[PDB]
Design a protein around this nucleic acid. Structure first.
Ligand SMILES: [Mg+2]
Length: 430
DNA sequence: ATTATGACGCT
DNA sequence: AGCGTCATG
């Protein structure tokens, strides 16, 4: 009762740039704007692999991880932009730089955690307190929430999308208690006002549109973000959780989309996240371990404690290339040439990182895949990264991997390599 | 031949 | 340290 925590102490948002690489290309090339468009890596094999898809193209069934030739079967007018190639490989610098533009804007409003190139969590708790003090008990107008959906509303006693959105928002705001500065629902609503302002600033200052979720923790904010895309935001209140979870497949919750989620489904014989409430914490820990069991117990009630980490920069800087099928590397000269290409891109990115961010990486991770290995990485080995020099880095990587060549001939490499990966890690301030 | 990343957990 | 999982609706 009065002692049961409800996990309503924070306001957290998740901001996701809509089809981010597509938007970067559409800003650069106006002919791609408001068209079915996708971004592809490479071209020779089946037209290249699609990695980002505009919402107009998604309407035709185009998706990521589809070959461009196949996408063109679904969408003959699909427009394509290709990722830049440098040193024989895809080079994502344009998108990393555009991501920095967006993250720097977001950081003006609140502390952000860079979850990925196109996604950031935002801790809004303090900003909401400040805005509530500035809002001396003044109600929140629907005009301050022009792109906000309130999940679960309208309910109870028009046939157009925007009309439905406004009906739900009106029900929410009429129900609000704008007098109580500690009301979690009011706090979320102010959070949504701030996120509208942040999203407007991003669009004005970059041209990029985003969707967002606002809730009391990261998992619910992420789930909320997915409910209304593109270019919209969704508020998931604590009270909305029972209904929302009652038909929510377990795999939709962040971290449960893989083997653990499949095991929850199979072991417990359930389908939906709300069904988890019927198990005790000890029962869940007995199946899924102490940590996962406690997390599931709280998360199915809408409660999660994982903090928004104050981290706007990536923790690693990596360069990776697959060599699939016939392109696998089979000679020593070939392996060394590609290690050098990767290391030259890595050196360029590291030197820029050091100038921009006042830090230096101290560990080099080298990973390879060998032909016929079911795992993504056949081997990972670390060595010291003491100098930002591509030739030294590629020589050191060759040194750490050279004992995997089972070929008795040092000129040949066997079995051929299907992946090379260099990653700089363990940054220290400088 | 579902890339090229990048997060975090386990032991 | 090296390996595995999860994510990119
Ligand atoms: Mg996105």
């Amino acid at each position: 009762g009065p002692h049961m925590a409800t996990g309503q102490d924070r306001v957290v948002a998740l901001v996701d740039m809509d089809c981010f690489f597509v938007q970067v290309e559409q800003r650069q090339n106006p002919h791609l704007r408001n068209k079915p468009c996708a971004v592809v890596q490479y071209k020779s094999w089946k037209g290249g692999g699609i990695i980002a898809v505009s919402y107009e193209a998604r309407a035709f069934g185009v998706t990521r991880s589809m070959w461009a030739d196949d996408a063109k079967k679904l969408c003959p007018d699909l427009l394509l932009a290709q990722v830049r190639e440098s040193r024989g490989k895809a080079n994502l610098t344009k998108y990393r730089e555009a991501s920095v533009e967006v993250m720097e804007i977001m950081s003006r409003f609140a502390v952000i955690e860079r979850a990925s190139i196109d996604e950031a969590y935002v801790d809004l708790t303090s900003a909401v307190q400040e805005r509530l003090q500035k809002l001396q008990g003044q109600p929140i107008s629907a005009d301050l929430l022009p792109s906000t959906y309130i999940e679960g509303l309208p309910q109870g006693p028009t046939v157009q999308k925007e009309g439905m959105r406004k009906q739900g928002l009106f029900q929410w705001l009429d129900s609000l208690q704008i007098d109580n500065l500690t009301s979690p629902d009011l706090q979320l609503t102010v959070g949504a006002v701030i996120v509208e302002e942040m999203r407007a600033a991003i669009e004005r200052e970059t041209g990029f549109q985003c969707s967002a979720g606002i809730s009391h923790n990261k998992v619910l904010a992420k789930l909320a973000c997915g409910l209304n895309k593109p270019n919209r935001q969704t508020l998931v209140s604590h009270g909305s959780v029972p209904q929302l979870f009652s038909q929510m497949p377990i795999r939709k919750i962040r971290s449960l989309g893989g083997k653990l989620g499949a095991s929850v489904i199979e072991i417990l014989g359930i389908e939906y996240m709300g069904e988890l409430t019927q198990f005790t914490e000890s029962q869940l820990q007995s199946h899924f371990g102490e940590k996962n069991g406690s997390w599931l117990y709280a998360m199915c009630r809408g409660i999660e404690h994982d903090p928004v980490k104050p981290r706007q920069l990536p923790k690693t800087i990596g360069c990776s290339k697959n060599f699939p099928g016939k392109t696998a590397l089979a000679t020593r000269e070939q392996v060394q040439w590609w290690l050098l290409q990767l290391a030259q891109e890595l050196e360029e990115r590291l030197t820029k990182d050091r100038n921009d961010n006042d830090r230096v990486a101290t560990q080099l991770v080298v990973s390879i895949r060998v032909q016929g290995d079911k795992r993504l990485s056949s081997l990972r080995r670390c060595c010291a990264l003491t100098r930002y020099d591509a030739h030294k880095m590629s020589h050191d990587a060759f040194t750490v991997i050279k004992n995997c060549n089972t070929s008795g001939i040092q000129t040949e490499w066997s079995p051929p390599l299907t992946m090379l990966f260099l990653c700089a890690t363990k940054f220290s301030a400088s």
